[PDB]
Amino acid sequence: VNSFSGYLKLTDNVYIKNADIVEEAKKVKPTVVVNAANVYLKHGGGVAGALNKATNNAMQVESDDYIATNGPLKVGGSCVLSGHNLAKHCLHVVGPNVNKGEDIQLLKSAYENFNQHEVLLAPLLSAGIFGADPIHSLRVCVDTVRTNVYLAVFDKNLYDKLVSSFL
Ligand SMILES: c1nc(N2CCCC3(CC3)C2)c2cc[nH]c2n1
């Protein structure tokens, strides 16, 4: 049994809700919240900008030290950093950004990072400002992630389309 409330069950392991990932994080304090990161961990906008704002920029300060030591992530890759006031840990995952011309086949590699964590609160990778079709992102999620994932979708409108169209 876990804390997550109000989710629709899509499969054995994937759940979905109309929620902003941050408010949900603040309420649940999950072990892992996933960030929709870029390779530079520059949390300017989208989910990343919202998560970082909710940490009062502490996520960005920590991320800048990570990059100064380790250099950029790979597209499709991830790192585990603090969850600050939102979660125990933040899994920063880099989905391909279609608005930079990155290969959408890297979306499966991105979701494979979730399998290293038994339970996660996450957004749909590569959606919003990364330009991918969220219906496609949900399909790759369901077909890739085997651990228990609670997806938060940032719009009542879109949420309803993902559910209605789910096979
Ligand atoms: C969950 N998902 C979010 N995304 C923003 C737009 C598109 C998206 C697919 C649903 C991802 C955000 C943004 C801020 N807070 C969020 N929580």
Side-chain angles (χ1 to χ4, degrees), residues 1-26 28-166:
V1 171
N2 67 52
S3 167
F4 287 105
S5 175
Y7 288 71
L8 175 68
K9 182 171 181 56
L10 294 175
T11 69
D12 182 59
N13 66 298
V14 177
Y15 294 80
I16 194 165
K17 185 185 179 177
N18 163 29
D20 173 351
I21 189 143
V22 190
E23 279 292 304
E24 191 77 2
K26 279 198 291 185
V28 176
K29 289 292 233 87
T31 304
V32 181
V33 64
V34 174
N35 181 33
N38 60 53
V39 295
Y40 306 109
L41 301 179
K42 288 173 54 97
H43 308 304
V47 166
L51 290 170
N52 175 58
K53 178 178 179 184
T55 76
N56 180 44
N57 210 52
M59 177 181 284
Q60 190 65 66
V61 169
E62 179 194 31
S63 292
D64 289 348
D65 168 84
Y66 173 89
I67 297 288
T69 298
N70 299 108
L73 300 177
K74 301 172 175 178
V75 179
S78 71
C79 67
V80 180
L81 290 172
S82 180
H84 300 277
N85 55 314
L86 304 179
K88 187 174 195 290
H89 306 285
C90 179
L91 181 69
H92 293 273
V93 180
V94 184
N97 188 330
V98 175
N99 305 316
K100 304 178 174 175
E102 299 168 348
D103 162 30
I104 196 60
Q105 300 304 137
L106 287 169
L107 186 55
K108 187 172 185 75
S109 301
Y111 274 115
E112 287 170 342
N113 297 286
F114 290 24
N115 290 319
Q116 300 295 318
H117 302 278
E118 288 191 346
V119 183
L120 315 87
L121 171 61
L124 287 166
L125 298 190
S126 287
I129 66 174
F130 289 57
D133 174 6
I135 294 174
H136 176 65
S137 183
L138 178 57
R139 183 27 65 188
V140 178
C141 181
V142 161
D143 292 345
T144 306
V145 180
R146 298 176 301 284
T147 57
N148 290 326
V149 57
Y150 288 86
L151 294 169
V153 175
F154 192 65
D155 194 56
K156 177 39 175 174
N157 179 299
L158 158 63
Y159 172 84
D160 287 347
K161 181 170 143 129
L162 285 167
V163 169
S164 290
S165 60
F166 184 69

